[PDB]
């Protein structure tokens, strides 16, 4: 039995190796009889042009529909018959394909990921079938006010840049995208130096690496020099997008200022600040007694059904703010208290509320890295974002050094007298005017 500090050192350091083609291979060994292994790629809609926006998402629909070695439902049958799980996700900057399986099945799992990542069929008839599946998913997503409002937030905050694009792409692209667009996209983006084979669980790094050499060696490490897709910074614009629809029962509002970007040290203090304000929803047991002033006011005065702060990071920018859902007559009050809270943290954060935020953050970090999948993902994404796995002991040091002064200074830096980006959807007649929202920033 150890103390909290002692336990941080209990963590097995993550092992990293690199194949000649430049693919990074990283793993974290545990005693788990199951594991998660996958490929994380530096590819997402932020890399897409208006013409092929939606390509990566389209590819996601094809990834598991058959390979050259395992056509049709063959790949499917193999994953299912060994009791494994195959998943995928695409964001604006990252794409991942991962498998959950018995540790003993690691060799087959790595072989299948390799087969998927290099020999995907992309059959013409499959492509046509997926058009309709994607079009139906776009209709479904239209009914998710939270997804709509966050895509709207990105559309206005990053208007005129690749980050304004949704991951799914515009319906017209889904109708027109050709196999050629998809192969051109995959050709330029799926390169060894932009990928990370990650694994977490009961396995050894040496076996992982040998399987890497065995199955990913032929993975291209060079598109050439005329391609090397490189991201330019994306301008943030203080702005507002309001989609009024009084036919919907509750209003969704998302507001954010420009955040620092993945690798910035400031993210730790911002996370502490966001933990102080926190999240909330009508089913929380706390009520009037919640520590967060926004949460207690909200609960006692019935200002919203829910709210959550957020810190969405991208390479050299991001969205720092909050989202809330409320009745048409509570929007102004919610905005008033939310901005009052940002302002109070900039000028008056207290040591005790900051320690509380630090404690909330510590707990969130460690409880999130529970299970092979979350750890595997942290490995894959971290190598892409920070270029290394940052150990818990390091996060602890970064957290420990945050105090009230640091919180005031970092919050002031990003929130104080800065233009926010605002997105609203639903019965929003009461959403404050942008000038009024802008004056609330000071």
């Amino acid at each position: 039995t150890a103390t909290y500090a002692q336990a941080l050192q209990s963590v097995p350091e993550t092992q990293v190796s690199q194949l000649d083609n430049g693919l990074r291979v990283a793993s974290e060994q545990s005693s788990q009889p199951t594991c998660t292994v996958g490929v994380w790629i530096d590819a997402g809609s932020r890399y897409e042009s208006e013409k092929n926006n939606g390509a990566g998402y389209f590819v996601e629909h094809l990834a598991f529909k058959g390979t050259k070695n395992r056509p049709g439902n063959a790949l499917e049958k193999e994953v299912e018959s060994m009791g494994a799980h195959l998943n995928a996700y695409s964001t604006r900057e990252h794409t991942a394909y991962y498998i959950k399986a018995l540790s003993k099945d690691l060799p087959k799992a790595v072989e299948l990921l390799a087969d998927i990542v290099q020999n995907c069929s992309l059959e013409d008839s499959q492509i046509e079938k997926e058009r309709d599946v994607i079009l139906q998913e776009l209709q479904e997503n239209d009914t998710s006010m939270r997804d709509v409002v966050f895509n709207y937030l990105h559309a206005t905050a990053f208007q005129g840049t690749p980050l304004a694009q949704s991951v799914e792409g515009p319906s017209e692209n889904v109708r027109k995208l050709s196999r050629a667009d998809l192969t051109e996209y995959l050709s330029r983006h799926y390169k060894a130096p932009r990928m990370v084979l990650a694994a977490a669980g009961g396995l050894e790094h040496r076996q992982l690496l040998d399987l890497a050499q065995k199955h990913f060696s032929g993975l291209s490490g060079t598109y050439d020099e005329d391609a090397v897709p490189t991201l330019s910074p994306c301008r943030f614009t203080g702005s507002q997008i309001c989609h009024r629809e009084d036919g919907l029962p509750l209003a969704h509002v998302a507001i954010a200022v420009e955040g620092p970007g993945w690798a910035h040290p400031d993210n730790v203090a911002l996370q502490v600040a966001n933990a102080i304000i926190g999240h909330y929803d009508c089913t929380y047991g706390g009520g009037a007694h919640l520590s967060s002033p926004l949460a207690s006011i909200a609960a006692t005065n019935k200002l919203c059904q829910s709210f959550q702060t957020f810190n969405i990071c991208y390479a050299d920018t991001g969205l720092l703010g909050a989202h809330f859902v409320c009745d048409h007559m509570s929007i102004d009050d919610m905005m008033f208290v939310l901005q009052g809270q940002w302002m109070r943290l900039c000028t008056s954060a207290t040591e005790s509320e900051v320690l509380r935020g630090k404690n909330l953050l510590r707990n969130a970090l460690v409880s999130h890295l529970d299970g092979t999948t979350p750890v595997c993902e942290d490995i894959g994404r971290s190598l892409l974002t920070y270029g290394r796995r940052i150990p818990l002991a390091e996060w602890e040091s970064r957290i420990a050094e945050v105090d009230a002064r640091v919180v005031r200074e970092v919050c002031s830096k990003y929130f104080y007298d800065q233009c926010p980006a605002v997105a609203g959807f639903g019965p929003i007649e009461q959403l404050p005017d942008y000038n009024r929202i802008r004056s609330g920033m000071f």
């Binding site: 000028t347 008056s348 009230a404 005031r408």
Partner: peptide
Amino acid sequence: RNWVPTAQLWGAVGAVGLVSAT
């Protein structure tokens, strides 16, 4: 907290105001 430094510039403003204005 920030109140001293802000109370001190509010302090100064009143003073310079009176001084000048009066």
